[PDB]
Amino acid sequence: APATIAAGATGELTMYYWVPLAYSETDLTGAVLANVPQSKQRLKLEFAN
């Protein structure tokens, strides 16, 4: 992100989030079985305004 957007300028931002389900890549505590065709999942995301 730019540290300062001046009067009349445009800034480009980038951000990465890791939304965890399992605890780590070697500990599967919290992981989700998703081999079920009729049961959907859902990931709701609210963004800024």
Binding site: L33, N35, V36, P37, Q38, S39
Partner: protein, 84 residues
């Protein structure tokens, strides 16, 4: 394994203020019944094949035949009239 000081000994522990005795006793946490959700599919479209592979390639063959074998016009030798 401490040594008792005979000049300055001490007694056992005296009562002190306490930490509100029910607040050191926990509740027993109450599990409800659960379910691995959904109807599971029987098979998965796997990204790798599940069988063996071969390290080296071996040359295969198939038999073929030749053809109808014909006769020939040989160059024929001379007669052994004691020169040969």
């Amino acid at each position: 394994m401490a040594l008792i000081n005979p000049q300055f000994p001490y007694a056992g522990p005296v009562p002190i203020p306490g930490p509100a005795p029910t607040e050191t006793m926990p509740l027993l946490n109450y599990r409800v019944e659960g379910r691995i959700a959904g109807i599971q599919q029987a098979r998965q479209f796997m990204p790798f094949l599940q069988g063996p592979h071969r390290e080296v390639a071996e040359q295969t063959y198939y038999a073929i035949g030749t053809g109808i074998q014909m006769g020939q016009t040989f160059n024929q030798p001379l007669i052994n009239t004691q020169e040969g």
